[PDB]
Design a protein around this ligand. Sequence first.
Ligand SMILES: Nc1ncnc2c1ncn2[C@@H]1O[C@H](COP(=O)(O)OP(=O)(O)O)[C@@H](O)[C@H]1O
Ligand SMILES: [Mg+2]
Lengths: 72, 7, 7, 7, 372
Amino acid sequence: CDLMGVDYEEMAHWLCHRKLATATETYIKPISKLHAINARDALAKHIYANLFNWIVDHVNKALHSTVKQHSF
Amino acid sequence: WXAXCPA
Amino acid sequence: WXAXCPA
Amino acid sequence: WXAXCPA
Amino acid sequence: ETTALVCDNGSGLVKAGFAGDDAPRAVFPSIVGRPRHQGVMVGMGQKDSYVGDEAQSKRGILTLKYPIEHGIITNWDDMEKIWHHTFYNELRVAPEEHPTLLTEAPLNPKANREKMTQIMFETFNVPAMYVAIQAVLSLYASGRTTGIVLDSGDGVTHNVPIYEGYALPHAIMRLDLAGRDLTDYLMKILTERGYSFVTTAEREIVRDIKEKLCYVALDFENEMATAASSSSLEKSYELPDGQVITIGNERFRCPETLFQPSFIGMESAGIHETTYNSIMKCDIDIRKDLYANNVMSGGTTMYPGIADRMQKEITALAPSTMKIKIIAPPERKYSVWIGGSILASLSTFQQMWITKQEYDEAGPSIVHRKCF
Ligand SMILES: Nc1ncnc2c1ncn2[C@@H]1O[C@H](COP(=O)(O)OP(=O)(O)O)[C@@H](O)[C@H]1O
Ligand SMILES: [Mg+2]
């Protein structure tokens, strides 16, 4: 939380609970230690894949050129 | 009465 | 229902 | 009964 | 591509949506209103009947009918109006494009399934459909393959024991107590305090009173002793006309009739004794695994303290040396829908559908052999 600039209490709550919303009404409910671990590892994988796509897009910004590409 | 009807 | 209860 | 069935 | 519709007809609320989303995006009461007063103003766009939230909004001028009573559909043209309204107005999806999955209570007449299938194929022209047991879906919803499901909506209550995915059809118990007749009991006891709720709209007011202020006593006699001896337990509620009404022991006393059906005058035992007498019909090797999972489902199980009362008196009935565990997730009101949403999205399930080819070949009789 210090590294990432988030409220400790919100990560500590949301890591252990998941939220479902009917169109009128929302329920917070707990999840088992297995679903909590699976969701932490899915968060780590989703962060990594988005960082990878970001580094690739900043490389592409350096490689592109303004002339319209006729063919490749 | 006290709700539905008048008495 | 058709016998016991009303539905 | 006393174990298996209900009586 | 194409995603099944999942619809649970219930009594009271309709709830419907698409397979593999997590909560229904249409929820509304299964209620039809027809206007009963002489219409005066010319040119008003006045309408022959109203469905769902329309009939709740205008209910002052309407007779309100429920087309489903105790899980049996009594009136078919209004049920067709409710499905027409669900597909076209609520979901805005043409039913020809989507398999439909439909939910039913166990032990109800076969004609109900034959008519539901004849209507879905002939009028809606739904390409494929299936009819599922309400209780079975609560296990899909709660992540289990074992347990005795206790389910109560409006209308029917039923217990269904399941062990590693095999149902035990001789042990299925069904009870007509739940949910609507609690409201017709609350209307009768409230009269004792000098309030009179007769009309079908006043029944909806009493239903809202019941949903807000009722709770289940841990010990019914201690709390009646307390509420006779104090004001501490007493709550007040504001009617739609701005009157205010005050409710005493009635609020715990109404849902106690779930555990003592003799109040309304039934001859059968409470939900705890039908649960225990359902476990007693299972073979002794599995009872340990049913006591370790009891799954509550449907809105009538939402009363505060109903889990701890169930666990307390089932722990009184059961042999002393066993874990009794009651599972009651806060979402349980939607559990049958969430379970049907899971079921309809499995790949193994895509061979289970009744297709229109089969209905054309075998007629509506097919539903009994293909479905459960
Ligand atoms: N929070 C609540 N507390 C007590 N009773 C409720 C609550 N919510 C709904 N109910 C009652 O439960 C019934 C609705 O349950 P539901 O599961 O929607 O029925 P169905 O399974 O037939 O669709 C109604 O009688 C309603 O009054
Ligand atoms: Mg239900």
